[PDB]
Each structure stands twice: as structure tokens, then as C-alpha cells.
Amino acid sequence: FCGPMMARGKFLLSYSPPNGTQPQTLSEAMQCTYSIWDIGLNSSWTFVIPYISPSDYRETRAITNSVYSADGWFSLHKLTKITLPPDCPQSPCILFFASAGEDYTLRLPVDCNPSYVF
Amino acid sequence: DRVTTQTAGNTAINTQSSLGVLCAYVEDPTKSDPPSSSTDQPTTTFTAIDRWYTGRLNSWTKAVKTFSFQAVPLPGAFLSRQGGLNGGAFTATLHRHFLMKCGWQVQVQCNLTQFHQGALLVAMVPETTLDVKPDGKAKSLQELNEEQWVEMSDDYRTGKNMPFQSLGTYYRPPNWTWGPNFINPYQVTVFPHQILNARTSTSVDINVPYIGETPTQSSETQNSWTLLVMVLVPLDYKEGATTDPEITFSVRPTSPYFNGLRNRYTT
Amino acid sequence: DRVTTQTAGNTAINTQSSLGVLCAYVEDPTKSDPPSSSTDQPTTTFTAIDRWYTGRLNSWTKAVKTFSFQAVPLPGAFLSRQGGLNGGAFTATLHRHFLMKCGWQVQVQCNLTQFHQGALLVAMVPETTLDVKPDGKAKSLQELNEEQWVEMSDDYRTGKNMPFQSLGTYYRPPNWTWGPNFINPYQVTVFPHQILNARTSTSVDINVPYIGETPTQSSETQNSWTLLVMVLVPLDYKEGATTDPEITFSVRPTSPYFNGLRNRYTT
Amino acid sequence: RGNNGNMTFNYYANTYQNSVDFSTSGILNPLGYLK
Amino acid sequence: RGNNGNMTFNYYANTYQNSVDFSTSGILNPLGYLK
Amino acid sequence: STDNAETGVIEAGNTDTDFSGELAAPGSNHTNVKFLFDRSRLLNVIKVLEKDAVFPRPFPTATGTQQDDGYFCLLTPRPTVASRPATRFGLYVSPSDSGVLANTSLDFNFYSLACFTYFRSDLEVTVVSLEPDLEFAVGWFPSGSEYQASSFVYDQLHVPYHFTGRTPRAFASKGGKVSFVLPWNSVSSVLPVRWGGASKLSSATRGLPAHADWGTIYAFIPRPNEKKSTAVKHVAVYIRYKNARAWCPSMLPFRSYK
Amino acid sequence: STDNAETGVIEAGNTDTDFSGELAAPGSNHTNVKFLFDRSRLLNVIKVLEKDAVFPRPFPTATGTQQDDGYFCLLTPRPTVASRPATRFGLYVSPSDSGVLANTSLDFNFYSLACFTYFRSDLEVTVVSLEPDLEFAVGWFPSGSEYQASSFVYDQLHVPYHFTGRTPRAFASKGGKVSFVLPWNSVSSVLPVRWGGASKLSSATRGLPAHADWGTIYAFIPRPNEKKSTAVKHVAVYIRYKNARAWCPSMLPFRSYK
């Protein structure tokens, strides 16, 4: 959370497994796997997205979309609105990262995409 | 220190200004014995109903006077879905059992800033009919929306508007003056309570065991505990501050012992 | 001796002409390991889904020819409610999980008298699409009522009417002649089968473990086992006897390991 | 071992030639057990 | 050893095949150490 | 002897069980699953690439889409059509008509003794030419990959991208053959010979496994696109199931009575 | 969990760190640097010498200088132009114009997983022909040498000086290939994938390493200059990084969003 120090509020960090339709309501993401994140003295929250898969490995290139490549949606809801004190900038900025877990494993090197060099 | 994360099942919640889990009437209210008024094997807890059920509560303005309260019946909020509080795997099990018996562990969040003043009185009140209209029927979702806050009139202080059986045309109807499900608003702090002050905390932490006249009460009718958010000091803020802070509440049923499996409850 | 009562949960069933529980492919198919393709804690069995689920099957007349069969997909019968087979606490849990993994223990009752002749072939067929119409969609309740018995034509013996993806107007559509989900009706006894003869028994007892291409398959799509009641010798009776004996079946899911809790399945 | 007459010497190792399974942690039995 | 399935026998020596460095005199550590 | 076949277990007996005889010595074990499937057989006669091809678009396909049919060999004993896995097997009876005649393939020697449901084996592909003195090259891409379909210019010669790659492009010699054993690479634990589930959730075809394969090989002449000839060259694909394991006994195909 | 990403060290956690789960078994180690780069890939399609060539003069080059362009393969994953190491990589979009179209090369498969700065490996060169039944020969000269460019008369045949030498001139057979592993021969200890220094002191280009290479191979038909043909023959250069070691983690190229 890259906002001011005096800002408070709570954020809901809900990973949904693959369903027929992406959840939109806060009550539809509460039923999934979530974690309510608080703002305070610390300013980070490593939401470890679990590995829920019908196979031992998952595909990493959704050419034809299936349950072997797409593993459901991530969704960040604002649970309570951000209570800013007077004379503080409106609309703060949540900054996202993406690391890998301590058990993240890879397999089968394929050919790359030279689309960067064009 | 003041940062307590309470992992339960899969829904783990957090707070960074906690005051402490007010365990009520016992040391560990999670420990509970099976009922002695049943001979079948009770459906104990499992990892889909041992979790936190977060709902919403109505907002809190400057127009809220002193002692305007708002009651959440337990487990009456799971049936009527008060504040969007959907139980999921708990409501779909509580409709399929005749005797339910669980302790509750509630937690009301309300994030006041350091420039607001006002103090809620979040308390768990045993055995009241504060949701039920005086005609006999409980409030719907619109009736919990048209008013947003139940004002402490003379009828709630005395116990005059509690539901009753009409005597009929044979008797002469008396002047109803008292009834034992009153609120004494000056004495709500006898209950397991924590004050949600604007300058000490944003979340109160209450933990209550099972109490009741029978070793396990019914499922579709009981009103054992009742979450009771009462406004002691009214809200005040200078203009420009964050207006109308919302109130949530998170309910976790500790150690439920269902009995008497039957099909889904149809009146 | 031949009187075996099989108490499971609360729904205990009885039979007095049993031939023996045909445990398939292992000694004890109740014992099963948790899946290795999930990292969350699996919802194991509990005393509301460890029980016998009795449904109905279509009746059996003299107009039934040889090899006219009738398929019950498992757990496809719990979803579509084939024959009134309502799961109750099992269907309401299988709709809320993405990976299901259980073995089945079926039992088909059909009470022929000592003056009737005819023999069913009750078998548990792995991995067939016998319920699904060749357009791609499964049969409804009326389509399982307008015919009462699926006749073994050339399309079922060969594998020609199984569902397919249409090639489109770009390709020339071939003459479809074969497909690997055929029935060889002379070779259904390779499967775990018991003959429900008119003169030895009234109930067959099959017990199958979990098989499948993955250590746990999906819940709303899988067709691992398929109960397959096939008429080998047609029914015959002199006039005055009890006409059209009904067929039931009792299904008990042995050791289910659900995974991947989500909300109720909506397409 | 199947249709393999090379009793003596395997040049490539067992992981490269075959494909072993990663761990998680004469006599022909019948396929149906009457109990 | 890398992508080398020849566990048995190296014909050319280690100096001819590889290129060693002349002397002057499972567990994956992090790349940044907070101190 | 006096038995009960309604029970479902019939104990196999010798001549000495009912009569006065003896046993016979068990001679050979050629019914062993690891021994029976360990032999080569024709899978698909596929055509050889001469240019940067396009992988065939998924079904159903409307007209006008310029793709390349019958150039890819989906290494699966199950019925395929247009180098994609299918369910029904179709062959052409009056083929001399319009439309695009799709390449269909099936393992004929497999299903006659595929009396089981599940199957897992390391495939051994041999790619034998059907052309006098042809130098070709065999590509591959695993179960769960796709064909990289373009061409990068090398010295004003349009070299396609299927020369390079991390997947084995084995080059045949002039008059030689290609032979390399492929491991079990599918995301499934076993290959369902018979399948009744559905891979997708909506608009899924019941009985069509998405990734029950060993990938897809193809053949390509190792010359750039400017050296494209006109006459079409074929190549034959022989497969062998090394280290076969088969579970769950099942049926054999219906032999007709005519 | 509750962390601080401003600190710069974020400990990677499992599902069991925040939720009620467990670990997963580490299956494969295909992310190993010594394993990942140990595979062949196309580097440059270079033309084959037929006469005693001239090594291309250093940049900038004015017109009229009779040199030989696109005949030499500077064995480096970095961007090259006209067989000399460069910094910017350029390719031709409307190439059918005047001037001399310079040979540019780049290792496409390298930079997509060159997430590091420094790199050292013994190169394994394979020189595959792009000509039906060609007998050629592969020269080489190390990092810090130059091409001996003349011809000494042998029996009235102008044999060029790049037949002889102390550097490996590997002769291909007719229809055969060339394959020989080259050691790390550069004067630098490692090969900078990214470099910001300057090799010279005055008039130096920032970011152009002078001797970050494995030398330069070339191809030449092993006939004297009187047997020079007319049609230009090409040859392809495949390289493999044996015993790779990569230091100093860095960036990956910017994938566009269009």
C-alpha cells in the first residue's frame, strides 16, 4: 500500500478456483479462499495463491482454455472504504508484486517467443 | 502484542488494534460436552463450519441518538440472512437438524479514525426478543433497512412492546405495562461486552459458550445469544472527515453439536 | 448364511437371498488413500454421506428383447436425479466441491417369483457414455421415460452413436463407422457383474473401488463407473402371475475424498 | 522386463531410458473377490 | 553435471573435454541478505 | 463341477477337476502385457512439410480458413481426425467428392487386444520414409504444447521456426530412418482407452480426452521455403509401446457376423 | 503474511504459511543453468567461402572498399552486424533497396532466459549445411586473432592460406556435418551479456565489449580458387553452451503489450 501513513482501511484478497463465471459480488468472493488484509505499521501482504489442480503439473500457456492452464481468478475487493484524514491525497495506490512460492517447480523447456526483437 | 491473527478453517481474519478475546463465563468456551438429551450420534464440527462468517451491519451517522441500538440474533441471522450474513455450509446444515448447540465467537469491526469521537457498546445479550416486532413476527430485510437503528424508547426500556398472545374478546384487554424481556440500557455492561471506542480499538473480540434452558435447544427457533451494538456516545466529526463509518461483524460458531437429522425446514 | 444385513450410517438394508458382495479388483475396496493432486485438506467421509441411497429403475416387461439395457451413471445419477435417486447430503456436498473421488458399492434389487423366468446382467461398467445422446447432451427425465429400455442396435454394438465434435463445413463429413465407447454385449461379464437370475437371488451385491485417469477426477463431469442392467434372457410368465416386476438399486459411496470447496455449481 | 533381450549392459541410465514415477510419501490373482 | 547422461566412461580427459581454471594461490541461497 | 455363475466368480478348473486327467505345463508367456505391446505397427501416413505450416484450427471449422491438413501425426491409439483427438472414427467410402478429405487414423492392432480401460507406456516412434532417397527431419511437441508457426529470415531464406526449439528435431540421413523413444509426458496419469468424463465444463464433448496423447510428431524437409518443391512426399510413422502397463479390464470390439 | 516489501527481502512462503495446507514435492530441476543452456539452437546462416576472402574492415566503412560481407560467423549471443560485435540489433523491413545489406545475427533463444549479466560456457559448434550434398570445411580463429587473407600458389592453383593453420579446420564429408566443442578462449573471465564499460579510452563506444566472443567460424569449399562456382551456397551454424555458469541476476526483454 503506497498511500499515506495516516490512511487506514481493509482489503479482501480472494483467490477463486475455476468456476463457470467469475465472482463479482463481495459475498461471492467471501465464500472462496480469501484473506482480509489490514493497513497499519506494516505495509505488505504476501498472499500465497494455493496450487489447486486436478493434475500434478499445470500448463503455462492457455492456447485452448481448460482446467489444465487456467486456475481461476484473483480478485481484490475493498472491504471497508479507505478513511483518509483531512489534507491527505485522495485515491491512493496499491502496488502489486508477483513472486513464486518456496515449492515452485518448472518443467519441459520449449521454444521462446522472439516477438520482443521486432 | 496488539496484532492478533485468528486462523479458523480457511477464513483467517486479522486485526492490528485488538484488546483481547473476552472469553465469557469460562476459561475456554471452545471446550463443550455432547448433549445428554439425545440418543443418536451428534453431527460434530467439521472443517467447513469451523470458520468466520463475515456479515454487514447498518451504518452509523450523526443522526443516531444515545442508545439507538441494532440487534443481531444468533443463529437467527443465519436463517433470515440479516446484513447479507450467509452461512453457506452452516446454514445448509442448520436447516437439516432439529437440535443445534454451539457456542459463538463474534468480532465486530468498526474503523473510526483518530479524529472521530463516539463509542459503540458491543455486547452479547442472552435471551432477548429484540428483533421480533410486537405483533409476533420477526423483522424482514426491508424493515431492517427502513429504520437502520432501533431507538431506545420507553417501550424498550420497560419491556412493554414484547410479543404476546392476544387474550380475545372474552377478556378485557389490560393496560400492558411491563415484560421481562426489557432492556435496561444503563446495565448492558453486565453482559459480555467490549466498548468499541474511537481512540483505543477498531475491533472488539467476544467469545461466549452455549447457554440455554435445555442441554440442546431447537435449531429454527432459538435465540440464545444476541449481538447487541449500542451507541453510548454519539458520533461527532468536523466537516471533511470520513462520513458514516460502516460496521461489520464476524461470527464463528465454536464447537457445534447438531442432532436430529431431517430434511430441509419447510413451514 | 444367505441373510446379510448391511448397516451403513442410519440407512440399513436387508436381503435374504444374497449371493455375496462382489468386491472388485482388490480385497477391501473401502480402504483408499487420499489424493496426491491436491494440497488442501480433503473433506473426508462423515456420517451423513456414508449411507445407502435407494432409487428406482424402469420396469421390466415381456416386450423387452434380448440386450435391451438401462444405464445408471455414477455419480451422474445424483446430479440429474435419475429414477428419483436424490442424494440429500451427498448431492448437496458434491455440488460444492471440484474434485470428487469415491468408490461405489451398489446393490440392485429385483424380486422375481419362482414361477418367472428371465435373468438380468447387473454390471458396473467403467468409462462409458451410454446415457449421453449422440448429439452431445445427456438424457433428461422424460427421455429416460419415453423409451424405458435402450435397445442394443448396431449403433451401440459398434460404437457409432457416441458423441463427437462436428468437423464443420470446411471438411467433408466422413462415414462414421466406429468409436471406442462401444458395448460388446457378449462380453459384459468381464466387468464386475452378478447375474440376477429368477431362481437364485433377488439382489446382487457389487463393490467397486475408485478408478480414473487422474488421482481424483472432477465432480460435475465424471463418469467413472456406470451401473448397467442388461437383459440376457427375456422375461416370461404364464398369465395370472405378477406382471412387470420393478427394479430398484441402492448405492453407497465408499470412502469419498472431496477437494476444492467452492460455491454451488451454476453453469 | 518385457520384450528386452539385453540382459548384460544398459548404456543410458534408468531415468533416461525409462520414465520412473516420483514418490508421494506366474502368480495371477483374480480380478473379482467374492466376500 | 548438467545435461550429461554419460555416467560411465569419459574417453578424453577432463582438461581436454572441459576447460578448468588455473589456481591463484537442492539448497538455493537468496541473492539478497538483509543485515 | 456344480458351480454358481450368478455369483460372479467362477473358479477356472482343469480336466482333473471333473474328470480323471492332469494338468498341462504352462509353455509360453506371450500374453504378458509388457511383452505383447512391445512391437512396432503402422500408425499414420503423414505428409512432409515443405513450408512454415499452420496448425489446424479447432473444431468446427468454417470454409476459407487456410490451414494445413494431414501434416501432423497425433500420437494416440484413439480415433483422431484432422490431427486432433476425436471420438468417432470415420473413413471415406466414396471419397472422390468436394470438400477437404480429413486425415483419420487409428491403431488397428491395438484395439483388437485393448481389452482394458487404462494404459501407460513409453512410446518408441520410428519414422520410416515412403519416398526413394529422401532426407527428412522429424519434429515433435509434447502433450500440452503448440506448434510455433512462422518463419524467421536467415540470409534472405525464409527458415521456419520449426527448425529450432527445445523439443527433439531428429534429422534423418539420406535414405536413413528416425527412431527415438518418447516418455510418458501427458498431464494425465494414464491414457484412457475408453473415457466417459468431460475435460471442459461448458460445451464439452463427453468422452473426448483433451490430453491423452504422447504429443504430435511431424516431418519436414530441412530446406528453406524458397526450395519448396511441388510433388507431395509422404512418410510413415511406426510406434512401439515400451514398458506398457494396463489396468481395469474391459471389452473388445464387436466382431460382426456377416 | 504480514510482511514488508520495502525492505527488499521477501521470504517465499507456501500455502501452509497463511492457510491450512502443506508443501508440494519438488518434481524436476529443468531450471538448472547448466541443464537449460545445454541444447542446440540456430545462430547464423552464413555463406560459404569460394576464394581467398577479405575480413570486413572496421566501422565506419566508406564505399568502394572491396570486402566480403556475411561470410563470417562471430560466435556470440550479443547483437552483431557485418560479422563484428555491435550494440544495437537491426533488421531489415524494406530490404529491396541499394547499399550492402549487412548480415545481422542474434541468439533469440538466449535472451528470453538471459535473466543474468555474466555468463561463461564452453561452446559446442555444429555446422549443418543448407545445400543438397555439399562437401565443405569449417575454419576458426580465436578471440583475439585475425583472418590470414591471401593465397599461396600450389602447382599453379591458388590455394588460399585458410586451408593451413594451427586453428581447427574441420573438414566435412560429402553430406556430413561438423561438430567440435570450443573452450572458453576470451581474454575476459566471463562474457558480459550486458556491459556498460568501454574497451578503449578515446573514441570508445559505451557498452561494446571488444573480446566477448568465442572467436569466428567460417565455411569454405575445399577446392582452390580456379574451381570457384557462381551459385552462392549457404550453411547454418548451431551452437550449444556446454558447462554454463551464469552470475549476477538481471532483466528479461520487454514483452510488448500489442
XYZ file of C-alpha atoms in Angstrom, chain B residues 16-169:
154
model
C -3.996 -4.646 14.489
C -5.716 -2.844 17.370
C -7.171 -5.753 19.311
C -7.991 -5.501 23.004
C -8.170 -9.223 23.756
C -10.634 -12.073 23.288
C -13.230 -11.642 26.046
C -13.780 -15.271 26.970
C -17.113 -15.282 28.780
C -18.206 -17.305 31.848
C -15.445 -19.943 31.490
C -11.748 -20.111 30.699
C -12.006 -21.975 27.383
C -15.519 -21.756 25.866
C -14.384 -23.866 22.902
C -14.461 -26.988 25.085
C -18.006 -28.308 25.366
C -19.623 -31.606 26.193
C -22.034 -33.504 23.919
C -25.735 -33.215 24.778
C -27.412 -35.609 27.189
C -30.908 -35.226 25.684
C -30.215 -37.262 22.555
C -29.509 -40.920 21.896
C -28.361 -40.635 18.283
C -24.820 -39.782 17.266
C -24.398 -35.994 17.001
C -23.007 -34.306 13.916
C -19.925 -32.682 15.430
C -17.827 -29.921 13.908
C -16.031 -30.242 10.591
C -13.744 -28.034 8.567
C -16.493 -26.302 6.549
C -18.449 -24.917 9.524
C -15.429 -24.052 11.680
C -14.829 -20.695 10.023
C -15.564 -16.977 10.209
C -18.828 -15.709 8.733
C -18.495 -12.012 7.955
C -21.679 -10.005 7.510
C -22.665 -6.375 7.325
C -24.385 -4.139 9.820
C -26.090 -0.805 9.260
C -24.053 2.378 9.114
C -23.605 4.872 11.934
C -24.286 8.579 11.408
C -24.518 11.728 13.491
C -28.314 11.333 13.465
C -28.002 8.295 15.754
C -29.014 9.394 19.245
C -27.852 7.865 22.507
C -28.836 4.184 22.981
C -30.096 3.669 19.448
C -29.112 0.032 19.064
C -29.158 -2.722 16.465
C -29.596 -6.391 17.323
C -28.189 -9.445 15.546
C -29.892 -12.662 16.709
C -27.779 -15.795 16.721
C -28.348 -18.086 14.931
C -31.308 -16.011 13.748
C -29.038 -14.047 11.417
C -28.142 -17.216 9.504
C -31.782 -18.008 8.716
C -33.106 -14.596 7.712
C -29.747 -13.518 6.170
C -29.509 -10.270 8.117
C -26.915 -7.959 6.623
C -26.064 -10.449 3.903
C -24.712 -12.869 6.513
C -24.939 -16.089 4.507
C -23.796 -19.178 6.371
C -23.083 -21.362 3.374
C -22.210 -24.794 4.737
C -23.539 -23.875 8.192
C -26.980 -22.621 7.161
C -27.351 -25.618 4.834
C -26.644 -27.893 7.822
C -28.660 -25.980 10.427
C -31.768 -26.287 8.261
C -31.298 -30.068 8.285
C -31.098 -30.605 12.038
C -33.653 -30.266 14.780
C -31.385 -29.642 17.775
C -28.443 -27.272 17.470
C -25.993 -26.496 20.262
C -22.968 -24.268 19.732
C -21.047 -21.500 21.375
C -20.363 -18.324 19.476
C -17.229 -16.254 18.966
C -18.132 -12.899 17.470
C -15.957 -9.959 16.418
C -17.327 -6.555 15.403
C -15.103 -4.328 13.262
C -15.731 -0.586 13.018
C -12.815 1.590 11.909
C -13.020 5.040 13.456
C -10.202 7.462 12.735
C -8.228 9.366 15.378
C -10.294 12.484 14.567
C -13.705 10.902 15.210
C -15.325 10.513 18.593
C -18.090 8.162 19.642
C -18.233 4.752 21.240
C -20.223 1.633 20.469
C -21.182 -0.866 23.159
C -20.829 -4.257 21.506
C -22.368 -6.839 23.824
C -23.678 -10.402 23.602
C -27.098 -10.348 25.279
C -28.609 -13.707 26.319
C -32.274 -14.458 25.646
C -33.958 -11.387 24.217
C -36.580 -10.829 21.531
C -35.222 -7.513 20.280
C -35.566 -8.418 16.604
C -39.190 -9.529 16.832
C -41.855 -6.917 16.143
C -44.503 -6.645 18.909
C -47.161 -8.269 16.698
C -45.285 -11.572 16.984
C -43.355 -11.841 13.725
C -39.680 -11.142 13.150
C -38.380 -8.253 11.065
C -37.699 -8.724 7.364
C -34.778 -7.254 5.429
C -36.661 -4.106 4.408
C -37.823 -3.496 7.983
C -34.150 -3.695 8.985
C -33.441 -1.116 6.268
C -36.215 1.468 6.660
C -35.016 2.472 10.137
C -31.266 1.490 10.267
C -31.217 1.829 14.102
C -33.803 0.897 16.741
C -34.339 3.865 19.051
C -34.477 3.227 22.796
C -37.991 4.441 23.536
C -39.999 3.858 26.701
C -41.304 0.597 25.254
C -37.836 -0.946 25.007
C -36.635 0.296 28.397
C -39.685 -1.015 30.213
C -40.453 -4.188 28.289
C -43.860 -3.118 27.010
C -43.553 -3.944 23.286
C -42.594 -7.552 23.555
C -44.750 -10.103 21.668
C -47.770 -11.592 23.374
C -50.770 -13.835 22.834
C -53.943 -11.793 22.464
C -56.488 -12.548 25.165
C -59.510 -12.305 22.878
C -62.922 -10.707 23.054
